[PDB]
Amino acid sequence: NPVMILNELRPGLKYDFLSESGESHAKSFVMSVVVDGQFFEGSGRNKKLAKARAAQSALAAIFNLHLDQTPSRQPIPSEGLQLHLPQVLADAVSRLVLGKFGDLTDNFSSPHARRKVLAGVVMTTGTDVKDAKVISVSTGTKCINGEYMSDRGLALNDCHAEIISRRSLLRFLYTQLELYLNNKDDQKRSIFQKSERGGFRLKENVQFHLYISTSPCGDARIFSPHEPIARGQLRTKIESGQGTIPVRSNASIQTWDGVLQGERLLTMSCSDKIARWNVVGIQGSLLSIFVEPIYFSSIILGSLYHGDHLSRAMYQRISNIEDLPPLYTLNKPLLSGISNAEARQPGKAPNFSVNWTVGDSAIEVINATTGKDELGRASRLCKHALYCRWMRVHGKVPSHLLRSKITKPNVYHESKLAAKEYQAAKARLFTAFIKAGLGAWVEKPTEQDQFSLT
Amino acid sequence: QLHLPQVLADAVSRLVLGKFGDLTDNFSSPHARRKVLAGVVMTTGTDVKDAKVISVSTGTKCINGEYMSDRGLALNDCHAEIISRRSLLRFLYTQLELYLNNKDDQKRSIFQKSERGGFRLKENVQFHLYISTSPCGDARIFSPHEPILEEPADRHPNRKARGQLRTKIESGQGTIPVRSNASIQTWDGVLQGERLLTMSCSDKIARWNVVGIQGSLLSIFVEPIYFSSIILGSLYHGDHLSRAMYQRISNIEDLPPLYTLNKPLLSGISNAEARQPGKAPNFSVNWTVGDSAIEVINATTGKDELGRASRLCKHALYCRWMRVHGKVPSHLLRSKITKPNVYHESKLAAKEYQAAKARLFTAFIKAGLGAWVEKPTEQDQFSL
RNA sequence: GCUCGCGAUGCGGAGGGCUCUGAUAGCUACG
RNA sequence: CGUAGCUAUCAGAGCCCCCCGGCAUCGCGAGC
Ligand SMILES: O=P(O)(O)O[C@H]1[C@H](OP(=O)(O)O)[C@@H](OP(=O)(O)O)[C@H](OP(=O)(O)O)[C@@H](OP(=O)(O)O)[C@H]1OP(=O)(O)O
Ligand SMILES: O=P(O)(O)O[C@H]1[C@H](OP(=O)(O)O)[C@@H](OP(=O)(O)O)[C@H](OP(=O)(O)O)[C@@H](OP(=O)(O)O)[C@H]1OP(=O)(O)O
Ligand SMILES: [Zn+2]
Ligand SMILES: [Zn+2]
């Protein structure tokens, strides 16, 4: 018991309360203390829990670590261990995303502050942790209804927080490319550089870290948290509710006329999508035509962390992958929990998804069931908006600069097919999942991308 | 004495309460604190001397969604009547082992070889369920109070609420109708905060009145067993209880051989028990004849206070089943459906039971009472 | 008879804070 | 040999606070 050990090692020490937040099941307190001058702090739904976490950080920073559970240990990154110790990096990206969300929700007082899952991307440009910069913040836990599908890219299909955070990261990447291409003097401020292999690549030591308030839905969450000590099957998000179901071993692909006749939309679980990002990269196909693949360096979970299950879901399940195109690889990012894990909130999920990217003046609210904003307009993150930004970048880069030839792009799906290497890596990933017995990836009907900007 | 229905009701209530008292140091143990008491009593003849208390239990809570076990080590539902059925299952396993021990021991077993294959109860062996209050759901929800003589019977029998399948809801109050277009529960969804739904006790008892009390696994060895009587120690309402236990699904059809829609005696007691003051205990006691002592389980975690699995958990029952299965010659099994040794698949080997369960679900659906809400499938996907 | 909407009065598992009693455990101080 | 004080846990009893989504009774409006 950290409070007991700190109270006996430093008998005269006294704890200091700060301020409570939320209400009922979502309420949480923040306690602080000052032993030998350091300003230790912790948090929990009840003050005695926050008390123990503040005393825990105090005992760790002034003495040694407590009786840490083995599954709670973090599988360290396969390479690139430069952003200090993994727990300090985890707690830093976690507090940064929570604080940016508090700024975007007027100190959690706005109606959109109530949420189940919170997500965000953090960028580090150097060895020091002071250099962190929040890139995107999002919330969401629902998917578009089958009847609200857009045949011209105006509706978001998946609004789970981590998915929306990646789309916001894509908005930041388009901004950085335009930042480099709009002026010669601004090239030093961009995160990109021209690559010796053609196109662009990230500047040295630029890293993105993903934070989710809970383990990603799907395979990463199929374990019993209270009995730690097993089949990485692919799963699809179910319609009418949170949670996933394994993909059927004998199921035909989605049809556009069938999503409105009987079959519910089958979106892949977030766990499978992050493994997919660990192979083909987080930039998607269109951005690959301009830049080299980008991968997350870390995956920080605010709750439901487990090293065996999360590592099995993020990459160990598809270690049999092979013959990847050059630059592509099986990412093995740092996986870690946090010192102040969130408590479970038993209750119904919100119908709205919140999203924000650095440089935006405010958050964007989306109705996850319809894939559009509360007043029926297309989202900044929708396919059509992304393709619009991509077209803007395509009209400024010389044809020789492109990593894949694609003169006069028109229909969205064809521009995606122009990324031959990304498509090849995606094919390798699909065969890896099949060869491992985890099932075949479910793809949405092609009519979903059969649209031109015109 | 003889067994005039009210005589029987009073006898079983006195026996279950008395046995609980014996087990709690004349109700002086800390574990004697209870809101709801349940039990199972066995009869053999007309002589009340032959009455036998089989199990006794207490509890009014169910598992916290975060504590679900993917190894079958946690009790999911600690409502007293549910725990009492599980304790009876332990008794049934023990009785099969008694039959299998030797030719001499078989005479004492409540089981006999069945001419239809496997085993059945010896003639006039009966089980009686006691609950100190009306089971939650359809029997309880429309009148959670002691009946009074000037109170008219249900004045709105035709309301659609009447007879509906209902679920306990995690951290919620009361019970709820299954929703329209009922959503499949998932393990990861519950872990993230989707509230765990559990079928009400009224619905579970109706289930037992079709598929029997022994469950699928025991049905691989034995023919369906039914309660002969259902005795409530308080809040008895004849019309509500009769609907809940069987009348609401009188539309059931195509049951497999030996299955039936069972209509046991329903009765209150002459001296109804009282409401007990006190915060309801977060724990649940269970005991089966032959056990030295009660076992105390934290209902929220589904485990004992030191985190050990209950003798009633899925894993423990699967272990009992495997031991009996290893002793029964193949030609005596009631089903010859071979299944991989994972609890879920072993349950699937009980083909006729699964069919009866399906007929039950359809009966509810066709009557307009909703669709049965199952646990996430991952719950039963474990092996020993 | 029922269904739906609004109102009113009631009935039946969670989270948080505060306070009082007991038991266990560790630590002080004083005579 | 005592007393007093501080913690940490459990165990129980009170003051609340905030939920949850059903059910009963009655009223009003509408439909079948
Ligand atoms: O971020 P998501 O919501 O998961 O959207 C992705 C993303 O689609 P967009 O970038 O066009 O929005 C993928 O695009 P790329 O990885 O190709 O850049 C696309 O993959 P494909 O074009 O390779 O099919 C995939 O589609 P699918 O689910 O059919 O695999 C689709 O996922 P959702 O349709 O679930 O949104
Ligand atoms: O009512 P309980 O005593 O809690 O146990 C039952 C029992 O499962 P266990 O015997 O494994 O404890 C049912 O199985 P059978 O005995 O009828 O074979 C099972 O239903 P299934 O057979 O379909 O698994 C049902 O759970 P569910 O209906 O949700 O699947 C489950 O009750 P709980 O899930 O409420 O614990
Ligand atoms: Zn998800
Ligand atoms: Zn009940």
Numbering used by the authors:
A (entry chain B): 235 to 463, 476 to 700
B (entry chain A): 316 to 699
Paper text:
ADARs (adenosine deaminases that act on RNA) catalyze adenosine deamination within duplex RNA yielding inosine. ADARs are multidomain proteins with N-terminal double stranded RNA binding domains (dsRBDs) and C-terminal deaminase domains. For instance, the nearest neighbor nucleotide preferences for ADARs show a strong bias against reaction at adenosines with a guanosine 5′ to the target adenosine (5′-GA sites).
Therefore, to gain greater insight into the structural basis for efficient editing by ADAR with a G:G pair adjacent to an editing site, we turned to X-ray crystallography to determine the atomic resolution structure of ADAR2-R2D E488Q bound to the GLI1 RNA substrate containing the G:G pair. We were able to grow protein–RNA crystals using the 32 bp azaN-containing duplex with the G:G pairing and ADAR2-R2D E488Q, which diffracted X-rays beyond 2.7 Å resolution. Importantly, the G:G pair adjacent to the editing site is well resolved with electron density that best fits a Gsyn:Ganti pair with the guanosine on the 5′ side of the azaN in a syn conformation with its Hoogsteen face accepting two hydrogen bonds from the Watson–Crick face of the guanosine on the opposing strand. The G:G pairing involves N1 to O6 and 2-amino to N7 hydrogen bonding seen in other Gsyn:Ganti pairs in RNA. The Gsyn:Ganti pair solves this apparent steric problem by inducing a change in the glycosidic bond angle at the 5′ G from anti to syn, moving the offending 2-amino group into the major groove where it does not clash with ADAR. However, the Gsyn:Ganti pair still presents a 2-amino group to the minor groove from the guide strand Ganti, which causes a slight shift in the base-flipping loop compared to the previous ADAR2-R2D – GLI1 structure. In the Gsyn:Ganti pair structure, only the pro-SP non-bridging oxygen interacts with Arg455, while in previous ADAR2–RNA complex structures, both non-bridging oxygens interact with the guanidino group of Arg455.
